[PDB]
Write a protein that binds this ligand. Structure first.
Ligand SMILES: Nc1ncnc2c1ncn2[C@@H]1O[C@H](COP(=O)(O)OP(=O)(O)OP(O)(O)=S)[C@@H](O)[C@H]1O
Ligand SMILES: Nc1ncnc2c1ncn2[C@@H]1O[C@H](COP(=O)(O)OP(=O)(O)OP(O)(O)=S)[C@@H](O)[C@H]1O
Ligand SMILES: Nc1ncnc2c1ncn2[C@@H]1O[C@H](COP(=O)(O)OP(=O)(O)OP(O)(O)=S)[C@@H](O)[C@H]1O
Ligand SMILES: Nc1ncnc2c1ncn2[C@@H]1O[C@H](COP(=O)(O)OP(=O)(O)OP(O)(O)=S)[C@@H](O)[C@H]1O
Ligand SMILES: [Mg+2]
Ligand SMILES: [Mg+2]
Ligand SMILES: [Mg+2]
Ligand SMILES: [Mg+2]
Lengths: 737, 737
């Protein structure tokens, strides 16, 4: 429902494309049963429509040699118009265009090779006799008096719109033909298909941008105001600017583009005028989209800035933003990677209010990007992109761009024998055969460019219950605390209770407190934000406490979300202990957390979870009803669960059939799940000491586990086990003395 | 494979040089079996190619008197063209150049001595009869009507390109002949051979700079984008600017050079124009390289800078950087020693993204520099440069330059008798004989200029296992933790384990924890970054915590790397102890380390190692699985290892045959390896008390060791030995209470 703009199917006038024989591109197909639906008439022009604007306007009709539900058409219309198969041509005629002084007439490429003379006469002139030219600017097709093809372009403008011309007219061949490059920048020009990884954010942009522009009567009918303020933001390199020029190409609205730096590089008293000129050009031209790219360049905080020409431009922009009446039909967009450095006044109601967040893409989204990049490359058969896309984490769209680049250049090194640098233009017997293998993507993925931007990430964890041995009651217990209130709202208001929003895990180390949290976030299919305690205490050597307020906020957009504060013992030991230097646990971040924890509605779909293995030093305030009032003690695994731990840890290993698991599980008593996973890691570490020596077979054996069990060491003491059972019994008391 | 651009061999047209008799340099050699490969024709011109551009274009062919695979040629072509032997002349003809108004005609040196008149007529005129002048500007050769040689230069330009001229023409002798200096600045001009110590960084510069320029079709073919943003950085004096003018001389691309200060010294509103003029001059001239030297002069952070003419130039540069379309074929380079003071916006994708790091050279690299400097000097026979290059550590390329200088000037002092300062031009009987001895390099290497830039260094240690007595299991044990995952990736994914990334050494003082780490970094041949704890705590009196984030980053470029945090006890005692003032160990840097330690992939090739001799105060958080979960206790040496310690410590000493080692080893019980090394140092301290007295023989004797053993003192207590065996047994428990 949030994607509902992607919906496009079932338009009667909407149909696919297929073969033509006719290499004079004047023609356009028909269909006999389709005209039955249509108004179509003999002669002049159709408006056929397609991807990314530009279209073809020329003579039409007679066909049906090829069958129908598909459209005949001249395969040059594929280099023009769309990319290729499967999409739609959209046709209605636009008849009887005006008769002018004739139009255009200039070549591009192959006319310069060979004998020219007066050109258009030499080759093309016989082609128009009483046919005369329904035409549009931008058509490039093959025509000759000769070897049977050369392409051709357009120059002159008598009117701006397209014509059906007459003779007696004056035209000119007097120009110079041209090179390719002007064509590629038409074909490389970006559409909605070059962006990948953001579906959810495009659905919000067309609802905000496109829909009010084309259909202003809608909001006018239900009586609602369109926002004029869209503000895009995200980390560097995430494709913000890219979504700009996509929407530039995809609109029927005049598009003006302001570069923040380009405004500031100007002289004083002048750059004040460039803005005033940009808001005047749009308002004149009916609907329009102004886009101010890199906004925080021109508008930082009036409280920290120096020059008076810097403070005007910010007060200049405010005075234009309020000069927008709905009558004008103008939408102002903007893009910034530092949304918190923007002047606060710009983000208030009536200026920039709607926000759209372009985030770091996840493993699905970054696969979609890798495919948009490499679709021009030639790849080997050993290339598994679903394998690559899994191995790149901190990478945003611009890193995958520089990843595909460092792999191609690694392939050019294996070829450095057959390339010379002393030669002028090298042979093409390598130029064709040079392809990119997976052995390269392993090399690029290990290099510098893997250095990438990495900060708070919000995603569904990949760990399911199947990764967790034992603990079957808490799995049951958690599902109630999280699923049912989010899944079944009817049950709770009925019986009159309000759900509780928070949970505290406690127990000995290594018993799975982290796994339980990531697991339930995957079952509810909610988002997961994880902040380890040592990260709370680090940032304040630079002294920024807004980063805690920023995390609760960030989880609010991501609702439904579980917000998991891990290793709370590290914060309560930030003083060293209860006796310690003599502080309590509450200081620093904890007072800022208990505050922000209370600003969240009990109806909220965000759900907080703590964890600590030091229940003695957690301060009384965290445990209050309304904060984390659900306490759950996770014990060491018993003997029957140690069976279940060992099994799940080995699901990725080539264990032998003869290894007897429940033999281990009952000889290991004070071990936690961290200890058993450590046994398995050494067992495989003794299997490799064979494997390399066995060279100078490969399935881990029953002897190795025997060997590992010797050194194995119990991580939880005999006194610890007891003491946890003291807090396991009553930690409610705690607070109050 | 990363060096693959150095590859140059097997070009058919590529061959060496050898003797000619012919002192009229118009000629150029041939070969009879080589022309069989060639197209070579009789008369006019060849393009012969060589080192650092400039070449010779003149008559060619007839030879074979001298044998082939070598080339005859006139030894003046050696002062021109290359330096000397062993390199290549590269030849193809460029026939039939145009017939002009004649060209040049002006002398340099020896014509001013003697009788001139009208010059060119007096001596050189008979030399051209129906031979007429295939020629190029820059040839300097011997010609006379007279004593049989004087050299000669070029002045006029009728066309820019070179000519085969005719008579009836008008030329002029009307200029004034000239001094040498204009020639030396041609010969001292810097090539790729003046730089030394960076091979790995040049391979990256030609892949980034040269290859896209000469061969833009390559990246166009495999469909990849060349970077326009190369940014060089490093400490002062490391030869950044030097790599600039090398690439200046070595390119066929127009080279423009911006000096940062020279931009800023200009008036306001003007220096804005000098940049705009510099990006316009390049774009006009096809491929081109703009180099902005000392970048951080013009572009510091827009958040800390004052004047508005300082903020324009930064927004001026941003607006030019984005005005670069690939069509332009321009690469913008830059150089800075303060990469973290550059405005953040310049380093984002699409502006300056590729980085190349010119580091402090190591002992090999600085030997290569010393040889590039002293190759003009006359050296004595006592000079061992491999000995000098070992003794200079904090020295970068510009210190070795000022080292070779302070040694030459020390040699001029021993000569101060035969030099007078009251004389005008001193005698040359010293001017020839003055040479540089090793007794000087000892003096220079002890002086001020040894004061040098010294900070974090990344290198393979010079200590191998042979330096370490005993500890044979940990040597085995370490190799698995480090080598096999880096050497044999096949074994680990097979059995399904992920390797663990970190190790914690603990034990009593002086037992070799430092040696074990440096040793395994040498065996894997990986890089070694060492940060002693007291260095973590010092910088924050200036309050900079980015230096911890900067160390993990720095180890990431250096992968494979071992990152060794030494003396962690000093950090955990930064409060004084557990009871202490009442803190825990975690504060300060430790919370910033545990954070940065987690941002490193388990697939990473960087490997972290800690060490502490105070296992009681290390905080629980370091030991968590995923951080340092491998604990290894290094015990005091037993009796059989104390034998092995004493032997390795003495490998550099003239021990007598009669000294009985295992006698010592069993009378020393509570001693650690630090204690035994201390015995050996006093034993040699008692040998020198003889040696000087023995003057008023030299091999250390068996008596001395007897004498030292008396005072020897046990550094580890009797209660310490026990207590370590308590933590040696269970330190896993630790965390959790
Ligand atoms: N989601 C995406 N899908 C496809 N390509 C992408 C995506 N994101 C980035 N790219 C590519 O990588 C480059 C990233 O540049 P942009 O996204 O335009 O810069 P940005 O996201 O505005 O970040 P800045 O400019 O540093 S604040 C673009 O040239 C794209 O070709
Ligand atoms: N019940 C369990 N089932 C499966 N694996 C477990 C279990 N308990 C612990 N482990 C293993 O122990 C490791 C750490 O588990 P966590 O969930 O991080 O434990 P924790 O409660 O966070 O305690 P620490 O101190 O952070 S190790 C994981 O790699 C798991 O494979
Ligand atoms: N790697 C090297 N090989 C040979 N000579 C070097 C090397 N590095 C420095 N030198 C010499 O020492 C001088 C160092 O100056 P540069 O390297 O040009 O300055 P820099 O490295 O840009 O440092 P700055 O200017 O203080 S940021 C040069 O004149 C070189 O002659
Ligand atoms: N096993 C050993 N073999 C050879 N030399 C040793 C050994 N143990 C200690 N030493 C000597 O002791 C000195 C210091 O050794 P380190 O490796 O620094 O010991 P450590 O574990 O760092 O303890 P400290 O407190 O730093 S001395 C070196 O000069 C070594 O020569
Ligand atoms: Mg941008
Ligand atoms: Mg954990
Ligand atoms: Mg410099
Ligand atoms: Mg040491």
């Amino acid at each position: 429902l949030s994607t509902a703009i992607l919906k496009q199917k079932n338009r009667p006038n909407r149909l696919i494309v297929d073969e033509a024989i006719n290499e004079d591109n004047s023609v356009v197909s028909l269909s006999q049963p389709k005209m039955d639906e249509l108004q179509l008439f003999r002669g002049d022009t159709v408006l056929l429509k397609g991807k990314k604007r530009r279209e073809a306007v020329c003579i039409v009709l007679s066909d049906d040699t090829c069958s129908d539900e598909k459209i005949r058409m001249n395969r040059v219309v594929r280099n023009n118009l769309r990319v290729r198969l499967g999409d739609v041509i959209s046709i209605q005629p636009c008849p009887d265009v005006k008769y002018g002084k004739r139009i255009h007439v200039l070549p591009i490429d192959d006319t310069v090779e060979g004998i020219t003379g007066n050109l258009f006469e030499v080759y093309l002139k016989p082609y128009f006799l009483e046919a005369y030219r329904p035409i549009r600017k931008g058509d490039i097709f093959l025509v000759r008096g000769g070897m049977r093809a050369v392409e051709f372009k357009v120059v002159e403008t008598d009117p701006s719109p397209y014509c059906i011309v007459a003779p007696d007219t004056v035209i000119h061949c007097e120009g110079e033909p041209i090179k390719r490059e002007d064509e590629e920048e038409s074909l490389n020009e970006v559409g909605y298909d070059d962006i990948g990884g953001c579906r959810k954010q495009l659905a919000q942009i067309k609802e905000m941008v496109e829909l009010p522009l084309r259909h202003p009567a809608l909001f006018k009918a239900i009586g609602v105001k369109p926002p004029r303020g869209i503000l895009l933001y995200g980390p560097p390199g995430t494709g913000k600017t890219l979504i700009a020029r996509a929407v530039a190409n995809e609109t029927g609205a005049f598009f003006f583009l302001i570069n923040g730096p380009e405004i500031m590089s100007k002289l004083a008293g002048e750059s004040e005028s460039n803005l005033r000129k940009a808001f005047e050009e749009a308002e004149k031209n009916a609907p329009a989209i102004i886009f101010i790219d890199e906004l925080d360049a021109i508008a930082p905080k009036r409280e920290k800035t120096h020059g008076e020409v810097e403070r005007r431009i910010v007060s200049q922009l405010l005075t234009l933003m309020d000069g927008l009446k709905q009558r004008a039909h103008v939408i102002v967009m903007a893009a910034t990677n530092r949304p918190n450095s923007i002047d606060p006044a710009l983000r208030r109601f009536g200026r920039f209010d709607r926000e759209v967040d372009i985030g770091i893409p996840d493993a699905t989204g970054r696969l979609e990007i890798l495919q948009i990049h490499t679709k021009n490359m030639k790849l080997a058969d050993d290339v598994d992109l679903e394998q690559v896309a899994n191995e790149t984490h901190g990478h945003v769209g611009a890193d995958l761009a520089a990843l595909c680049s460092e792999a191609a250049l690694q392939a050019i090194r294996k070829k450095m024998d057959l390339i010379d640098l002393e030669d002028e233009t090298i042979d093409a017997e390598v130029m064709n055969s040079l392809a990119v293998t997976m052995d390269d993507f392993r090399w690029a993925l290990s290099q510098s460019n893997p250095s990438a931007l990495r900060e708070t990430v919000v995603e569904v964890p990949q760990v399911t219950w199947e990764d967790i041995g034992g603990l079957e009651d808490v799995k049951r217990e958690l599902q109630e605390l999280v699923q049912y209130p989010v899944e079944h709202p009817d049950k709770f208001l009925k019986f009159g209770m309000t759900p509780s929003k928070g949970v505290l895990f406690y127990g000995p180390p290594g018993c799975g407190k982290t796994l339980l949290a990531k697991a339930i976030a995957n079952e509810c299919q909610a988002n997961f934000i994880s902040i380890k305690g040592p990260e709370l205490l680090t940032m304040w050597f630079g002294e920024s406490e807004a980063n805690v307020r920023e995390i609760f906020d960030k989880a609010r957009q991501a609702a439904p979300c579980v917000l998991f504060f891990d290793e709370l013992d590290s914060i309560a030991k930030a003083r060293g202990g209860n006796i310690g230097d003599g502080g309590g646990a509450a200081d620093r971040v904890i007072n800022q957390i208990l505050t922000e924890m209370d600003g969240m509605s009990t109806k909220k779909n965000v759900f907080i979870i703590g964890a600590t293995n030091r229940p003695d030093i957690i301060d009384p305030a965290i445990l209050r009803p309304g904060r984390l009032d659900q306490l759950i003690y996770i014990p060491l695994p018993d003997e029957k669960s140690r069976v279940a731990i060992l099994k799940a840890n080995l699901r990725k290993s080539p264990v032998a059939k003869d290894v007897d698991l429940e033999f281990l599980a009952k000889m290991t008593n004070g071990f936690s799940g961290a200890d058993l996973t450590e046994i398995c890691q050494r067992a495989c570490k003794l299997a490799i000491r064979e494997s390399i020596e066995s060279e100078i077979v490969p399935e881990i054996r029953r002897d190795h586990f025997e060997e590992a069990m010797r050194f194995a060491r119990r991580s939880v003491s005999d006194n610890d086990i007891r003491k946890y059972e003291m807090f396991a019994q009553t930690l409610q008391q705690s607070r109050g003395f």
